[PDB]
């Protein structure tokens, strides 16, 4: 039952040395509790597979070879985390990289949550350490920072759970690209929780990429926060291509004028999967431009869920915000639920949103088939083209090809 | 204390159906600002009031003073009660009408909710309307509602209930008209349910034109069979707080549906326009256009749910909500909810929020058109796609006049 899952997580919390901040989030976890399908934000995302499980929290050890077999081919400053723990022996040295990094459980400097919710509190409470990352004023690291997360399940019916917590501060004029990569060690199911919070100061430029590529049976529940000051730029691209049930939130505050924001995501549930991609955006100051593109491709008995809220505060004049959610359904058993929302309290603004749902039109495939292209190839071409606005945002070609290959595994004919 | 008072109004006999809705009402209770569907619609101004139920008497002169200029089959309702002395003959009009409190033939609600239950439980009678197979009445049916408040702090409440059945091949236009007798505040509840049979064609128009201080909470149901057509146009231009729901089921193939609404909250008004639509069978086309014009300190709320059932192939459904904000303290909250369980469909939703660009005003000013005339032209143009739906030119002008009262210098 619901209380049982909470009881077990509560037990794991008290198993350890918890910070005052994690204690506060534990209290909030218990005050908020777990939701039912009647809750406003949980009508379409099942928790039964999680709630009815017995949990464990074991931190294993892997070799360099096991890391390499799961790793992305990319020139980066790579930090490796295994079953909720930073592993120095598998990580790159950070001194002189342009990234100031300290892993510890001191949380006095972390900002408050933008949008509190149950799984954010769970991850805050259970994470055993925080990855404190900082890029100093005007610094532009030569290589992107890669956060590689390797989580494994245990044999039997128990569900191993690992919760990761990182914070990045980009000081004024700093420019950096950070990549989150999540993989499973094997086919055993696990429950991954994650929370990456980022502060972007004046004139700073952030490029954030999330690659959620865990196995087909696991649960992935994450909530990232983006806090932007004035004259700031932030782009976040999420490729949610792993897990049986995944629910990712990106909450953002535009707390300064003249900033630019883009938040995109791709979801491609297959089999009996549920992929839930959500955003919460607050235009608290005027003169900011935001653009969101969330595309989904749903096959088999899959279900994609989109939720996007944009709140424009009073007097946030010259706000220019757009949100688009395009959903492609493949097959008569596919499902998609979408709720793009607007709360607009300023008049001198340009705000709009749109959501579309359909399948590959016979008319579009007709012109590929007329050239002799077979059905599966034609469908793959159309799907890649549908995802192209999102995958073309990946500057590194090598990285882009790897993401395209992960997409390829979910296409008709693979 | 609202529930307790409403409960007492009920027991003050009542049909078993009304008893069932009251039971559900008390079981569901009143929602808070934390409820999924009530984040933006205030109930304080209503909940913290003392309710009464007084059925006042009105003269034909008072009726004519508030009545629309239109040739129709007019039925007049005053303070929750049908008034035969002020109504037209229905016998021989093309509309089979029976007014009583028998409710065994009424269909189940498409989307049960608190205020629908309240209106079902408190309505004192049901207007049973039917158009026989293949028939097309010469004049439209007009349901005119006249509600008045009482002197003092008490809030008079009146709940209206009507059901229209369009038999196979039947075609009809029905208009709901709501007005206030004077400036006194009242609480109006309404529920118009309509069954559209195979090959039947419905034209529904709602004109909610009550005073600035009243509360109007309504919920209409539209049920369509196969090869049916239904167009519903709502002009929500009255009340301090208005919340109108239209719930619809497309339960037959090859049907066409259009649901439009106009909302223009001013002062400190809240105008909440909501739709719930189920494409239960395939091959149906649905289109919705909801436009709002929000003045300073006003608040418009839009909520539109579209659910497309599994195997409802060839569904073609669109929903558009355009919002024009006219001042720095205007507010708009808009929430579509698409639940699509069929792949071979074309479904989309779009919403826009913005204001009149100063450059457009300046351009007009440079061409000899002043600010007020420029604003009025632009606002009327924004509402035009909705107002042009009114076939009767005489009726369209009266609606445009009501719109005009809310424009700069109106």
Overview of the structural elements:
2 copies of one chain form a homodimer. Chain A has helices spanning 2-14, 20-32, 48-51, 64-70, 118-126, 362-369, 375-391, 397-408; strands at residues 55-56, 77-82, 85-86, 100-104, 130-135, 145-151, 159-170, 175-184, 190-200, 205-213, 219-228, 233-240, 245-254, 260-267, 274-283, 289-298, 303-312, 319-329, 335-344, 349-358. By secondary structure, chain A is α/β, with parallel strands linked by helices. In chain A, the strands form 2 sheets. In chain A, strands 1, 4, 5, 7, 9, 11, 13, 15, 17 and 19 form a 10-stranded mixed β-sheet that branches. In chain A, strands 3-2-6-8-10-12-14-16-18-20 form a 10-stranded mixed β-sheet, with helices on one face. In chain A, strand 2 and strand 3 form a beta hairpin. In chain A, helix 2 (20-32) runs antiparallel to helix 5 (118-126) and helix 6 (362-369) crosses helix 7 (375-391). Chain A binds chain B through residues 40, 44, 314-315, 327, 329-359, and chain B through 35-36, 40, 310-311, 323, 325-355.
């Amino acid at each position: 039952n619901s209380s049982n899952a909470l009881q077990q997580w509560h037990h794991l919390f008290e198993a350890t040395k918890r910070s005052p901040q994690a204690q506060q989030h534990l209290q909030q976890l218990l005050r908020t509790g777990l939701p039912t399908r009647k809750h406003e934000n949980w009508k379409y995302t099942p928790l039964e597979g999680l709630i009815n499980s017995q949990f464990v929290s074991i931190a294993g050890e892997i070799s360099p070879q096991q890391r390499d077999a799961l790793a992305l081919t990319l020139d980066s400053v790579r930090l490796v985390f295994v079953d909720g723990r930073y592993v120095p022996a598998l990580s790159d040295a950070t001194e002189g990289s342009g990234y100031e990094v300290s892993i510890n459980d001191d949380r006095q400097g972390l900002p408050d949550a933008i949008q509190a919710e149950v799984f954010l509190h769970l991850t805050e409470s259970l994470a055993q350490s925080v990855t404190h990352i900082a890029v100093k004023r005007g610094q532009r690291p030569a290589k992107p920072l890669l956060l590689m997360h390797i989580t494994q399940g245990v044999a039997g019916e128990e569900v191993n759970t690992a919760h990761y917590r990182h914070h990045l501060d980009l000081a004024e004029g700093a420019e950096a690209t950070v990549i989150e990569h999540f993989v499973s060690l094997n086919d055993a199911r696990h429950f991954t929780g994650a929370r990456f919070t980022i502060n972007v100061a004046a004139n700073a430029h952030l490029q954030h990429i999330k690659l959620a590529f865990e196995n087909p049976l696991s649960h992935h529940f994450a909530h990232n926060d983006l806090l932007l000051a004035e004259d700031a730029t932030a782009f976040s691209h999420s490729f949610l291509l792993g897990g049986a049930v995944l629910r990712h939130n990106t909450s953002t505050q535009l707390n300064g004028e003249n900033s630019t924001l883009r938040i995109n995501s791709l979801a491609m549930p297959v089999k009996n999967e549920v992929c839930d991609t959500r955003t919460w955006l607050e235009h608290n100051k005027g003169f900011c431009n935001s653009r969101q593109l969330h595309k989904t491709i749903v096959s088999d008995k899959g279900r994609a869920v989109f939720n996007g809220l944009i709140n424009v505060a009073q007097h946030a004049i010259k706000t220019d915000g757009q949100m688009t959610n395009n959903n492609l359904l493949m097959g008569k058993l596919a499902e998609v639920d979408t709720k793009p929302q607007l709360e607009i309290y300023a008049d001198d603004v340009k705000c709009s949103h749109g959501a579309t749902v359909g399948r590959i039109d016979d008319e579009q495939i007709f012109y590929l088939r007329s050239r002799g292209i077979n059905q599966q190839d034609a469908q793959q071409m159309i799907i890649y083209a549908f995802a192209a606005e999102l995958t073309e945002a990946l500057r590194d070609e090598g990285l882009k090809q790897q993401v395209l290959a992960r997409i390829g595994q979910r296409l008709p004919g693979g």
